[PDB]
Amino acid sequence: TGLQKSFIMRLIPNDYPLESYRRVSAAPILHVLHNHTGLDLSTAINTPVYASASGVVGLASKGWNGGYGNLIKVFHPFGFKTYYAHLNKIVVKTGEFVKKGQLIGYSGNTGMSTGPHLHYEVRFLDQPINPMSFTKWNMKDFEEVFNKERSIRWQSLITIINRLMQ
Amino acid sequence: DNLNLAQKHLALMLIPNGMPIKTYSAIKPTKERNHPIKKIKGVESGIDFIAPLNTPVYASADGIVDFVKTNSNVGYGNLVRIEHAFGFSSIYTHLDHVNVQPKSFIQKGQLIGYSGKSGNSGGEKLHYEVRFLGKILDAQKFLAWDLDHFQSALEENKFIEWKNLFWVLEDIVQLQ
Numbered sequence: 001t002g003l004q005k006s007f008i009m010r011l012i013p014n015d016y017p018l019e020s021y022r023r024v025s026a027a028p029i030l031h032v033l034h035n036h037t038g039l040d041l042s043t044a045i046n047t048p049v050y051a052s053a054s055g056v057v058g059l060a061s062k063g064w065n066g067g068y069g070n071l072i073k074v075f076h077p078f079g080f081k082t083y084y085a086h087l088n089k090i091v092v093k094t095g096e097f098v099k100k101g102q103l104i105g106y107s108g109n110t111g112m113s114t115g116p117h118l119h120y121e122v123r124f125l126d127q128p129i130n131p132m133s134f135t136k137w138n139m140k141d142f143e144e145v146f147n148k149e150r151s152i153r154w155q156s157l158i159t160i161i162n163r164l165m166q
Numbered sequence: 167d168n169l170n171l172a173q174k175h176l177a178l179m180l181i182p183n184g185m186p187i188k189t190y191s192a193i194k195p196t197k198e199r200n201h202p203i204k205k206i207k208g209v210e211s212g213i214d215f216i217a218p219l220n221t222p223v224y225a226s227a228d229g230i231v232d233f234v235k236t237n238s239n240v241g242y243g244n245l246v247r248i249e250h251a252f253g254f255s256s257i258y259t260h261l262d263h264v265n266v267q268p269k270s271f272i273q274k275g276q277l278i279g280y281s282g283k284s285g286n287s288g289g290e291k292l293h294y295e296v297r298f299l300g301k302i303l304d305a306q307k308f309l310a311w312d313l314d315h316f317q318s319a320l321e322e323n324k325f326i327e328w329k330n331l332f333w334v335l336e337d338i339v340q341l342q
């Protein structure tokens with residue numbers, strides 16, 4: 001059911017976390033920074049950055065962070081995490097609860113960075129994850145992510161998520 | 167407070183609560199015994215249910231198994247650690263048998279293991295911890311938290327900003 005789509009989309013990361021990227025084609029290049037494939041989203045310094053799903057800010061770290069620069073890690077339900085790196089400014093703290101689409105920081109050029117961009121990652125536990133499978137995942141192209149990121153045991157996760165409602 | 171039914175229901179599926187073991191003779195803080203890893207008293211480290219061998223153990227909320235040990239007789243012994251939503255984790259220790267595997271999804275109420283005395287247990291018991299971003303919480307406040315006694319967990323507010331959390335949950339439940 002379509003109600004389940006929205007609900008699922010509050011909990012599991014999806015869409016682009018910069019507004020200008022979600023507008024142009026949905027309504028981006030692959031880069032390994034620290035052991036995981038991120039996505040680099042070219043954009044000017046201080047471009048607002050939004051949470052891809054609801055969760056807790058697991059880390060809001062103002063540091064070098066392995067070359068990530070200023071870094072937010074949002075911990076989502078069921079072992080999903082999102083990383084937002086090279087930030088110029090962080091407007092949430094460690095332990096803050098955020099909702100999907102909430103402003104969490106502003107883009108920058110901090111850390112190991114050649115020009116201003118957002119470095120974005122979707123993680124699931126400890127296994128490699130393609131971020132495009134989640135950034136392209138949206139309300140129209142909804143079923144897609146089950147066939148694009150097959151390595152997640154969706155059948156168990158869907159069942160469990162559907163049980164949460166009533 | 168002004169929290170709706172749906173908010174409370176979702177919270178109690180996602181955040182650890184209630185009894186992970188349904189038979190015990192007593193509950194004691196682990197602080198008052200020799201800690202499993204750090205062999206000393208005086209460590210804030212959750213609680214122990216004094217329970218017979220092979221008493222079923224249940225997951226205190228939905229989530230994912232991030233760590234398991236089986237056939238261990240040192241330290242914590244056999245254990246399950248579940249990662250929950252919103253930074254919470256629960257750990258179950260000194261088990262005799264483990265029923266789940268690392269990386270599996272978990273539902274609240276699911277059988278995860280059976281209590282024992284494996285590791286540095288001081289005998290037959292379940293050792294249980296609730297944690298928020300790795301930080302040790304008062305497990306008793308989560309035990310006593312249910313639909314009818316909802317304030318209990320909100321009293322543990324040193325690390326956790328409960329109003330902010332329910333604001334996030336309101337947005338989620340608002341959909342229906």
Ligand SMILES: [Zn+2]
Nearest residue numbers: 031038040119
């Ligand atoms: Zn990058």
